Amino acid sequence: DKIPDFVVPGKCASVDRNKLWAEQTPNRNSYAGVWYQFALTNNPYQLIEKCVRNEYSFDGKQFVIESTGIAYDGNLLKRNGKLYPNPFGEPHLSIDYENSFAAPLVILETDYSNYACLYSCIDYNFGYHSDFSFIFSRSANLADQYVKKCEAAFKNINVDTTRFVKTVQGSSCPYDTQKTL
Amino acid sequence: KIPDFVVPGKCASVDRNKLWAEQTPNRNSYAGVWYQFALTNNPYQLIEKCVRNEYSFDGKQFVIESTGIAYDGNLLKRNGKLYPNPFGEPHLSIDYENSFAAPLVILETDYSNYACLYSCIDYNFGYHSDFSFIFSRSANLADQYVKKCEAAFKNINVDTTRFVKTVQGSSCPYDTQKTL
């Protein structure tokens, strides 16, 4: 039987969240600014297809996010999000978007000034999980040397990195318009 | 051949503002114990049988302790919260430990006997998944109340033939559950 490639046998991987939380908590401000989605694994919840540009502002307690790009129907779209600590005190963040749902998000690795590797995972009641991974860049392109760092990080928690698909970015994108939305 | 909980089209419009206006003043009456009477197929629900949800309202949100028999036959406790949607939208978020948070609308409730609850998420490919529940204040629920819920789901075009009854009653260790 065929199932989607983002439904995978087994339980979500462990991820040493307490380590990452302690490393990231004092650096929150540095995570703010603009991040471009360089690539992601197949994700049925993402409404923005191309030129995905995420603007993060940090208010000391959470990040407010303005995500923009071209939707699957070819129109420009702006979505409003928030990233805040998980409400039960677990050492991870919730990413929540307006008119959507919220999901756990771990920053598996970032150097803050070039790239970030992101990960979210959900267990089902029937012996499978679904995970969603992103590679984020501070610019429209990202050098092979940083892509490999994410690839290693994902490979290490057992994610099939052949699942990554590159997002359209670059001078074909109307970034100046997107920022006015 | 897709799961019966992946449905064509966009999530339904549900008159959330009308609901919110009704329920806001009555939040305290929504606390206490609610049994899951029936639900549509849900892959995120870890508790299979004897599902008992205890709600406490602290003024801003509800704190939830959900208990019952897991799919492996063991007893399970899950901690949840229910709070206003953080963007200011007129609905609630239901959020469970080591899970995710989803929008939750109470389509109808009389507080003393039943509640009909609904959650919907849209996909980028033109389909949605919705999850529906019938809650009761007792292990059983009279027919007249089930029917009110069936009417409310029908009104939003949910196919009520998707509902399955949850095991409750004699076979359940509620006394032990209360203890977890």
Are residues B37 and B134 in contact, defined by beta-carbon separation less than 8 angstroms? yes
Give the three-class secondary structure for A49: strand
Of A88, A96, A126, the CB nearest to B86: A96
| Mutation site, B98, B121, B131, interface A, largest A CB count within 10 A | B98
- For the record, the structure tokens of A118 come out as 């992101």
- For the record, the structure tokens of B83 come out as 């709070």
Q: DSSP letter for A13, please.
A: P
Q: How far apart are CA A35 and CA A116, in angstroms?
A: 9
Q: What is the largest CA-CA distance in chain B?
A: 46
What number does CATH give the domain A1-181? 2.40.128.20
Give the three-class secondary structure for A81: strand
Chain B residues in contact with A122 (beta carbon < 8 A): 44, 99-100
The Cβ of residue A33 has, within 10 Å, a number of other Cβ atoms equal to 14
Residue B125 to residue A96, Cβ atoms within 8 A = no
The residues that bridge with A66 in the sheet, in sequence order, are A55, A80
* Residue A153, C-beta contacts closer than 8 angstroms, at least 6 positions apart: A108, A109, A117
Q: How far apart are CA B160 and CA B142, in angstroms?
A: 17
Dihedral, A18, A23, A24, A25 alpha carbons, nearest 10: 80
- For the record, the structure tokens of B97 come out as 């430990």
SS3 annotation, chain B? CCCCCCEECCCCCCCHHHHHHHHHHHHHHHCEEEEEEEEECCCCCCEEEEEEEEEEECCCCEEEEEEEEECCCCEEEEEEEEEECCCCCCCEEEEECCCCEEEEEEEEECCCCEEEEEEEEECCCCEEEEEEEEEECCCCCCHHHHHHHHHHHHHCCCCHHHEEECCCCCCCCHHHHCCC
Q: What is the largest CA-CA distance in chain A?
A: 48
Chain B residues in contact with A49 (beta carbon < 8 A): 124
Q: In b/e form, how buried is each residue of A157-180, taking b as 16+ CB within 10 angstroms?
A: bebebebbeebebeeebebeebee
Cα distances from B100 to residues A102, A118, A122, B125, B136, in angstroms, run 6, 16, 7, 21, 24
Chain B residues in contact with A123 (beta carbon < 8 A): 98-99
Are residues B69 and B48 in contact, defined by beta-carbon separation less than 8 angstroms? yes
B13 touches chain A (CB under 8 A): no
The residues that bridge with B57 in the sheet, in sequence order, are B62
Are residues A101 and B102 in contact, defined by beta-carbon separation less than 8 angstroms? yes
User: Would you kindly state where each structural domain of chain B is located, as residue ranges?
Assistant: 1-180
Q: How far apart are CA B52 and CA B61, in angstroms?
A: 19
A101 touches chain B (CB under 8 A): yes
Q: Where are the alpha helices (DSSP H) in chain A?
A: 17-24, 28-31, 144-155, 175-178
Residue B87 to residue A90, Cβ atoms within 8 A = no
* Residue A136, C-beta contacts closer than 8 angstroms, at least 6 positions apart: A35, A36, A37, A38, A54, A110, A115, A116, A117, A118
CATH level 2 (architecture), domain B1-180 = Beta Barrel (2.40)
Given resolution (angstroms): 1.9
Residue B7 CA to chain centroid, in angstroms? 19
Residue A101 to residue B103, Cβ atoms within 8 A = yes
Q: DSSP letter for A56, please.
A: E
Residue A55 CA to chain centroid, in angstroms? 13
Residue A100 to residue B122, Cβ atoms within 8 A = yes
Are residues B174 and B52 in contact, defined by beta-carbon separation less than 8 angstroms? yes
In chain B the first and final C-alpha atoms are separated, in Å, by 40
CA nearest to B3, candidates A47, A128, A134: A128
Q: How was this structure determined?
A: X-ray
A171 touches chain B (CB under 8 A): no
Chain A residues in contact with B84 (beta carbon < 8 A): none
Residue B99 to residue A122, Cβ atoms within 8 A = yes
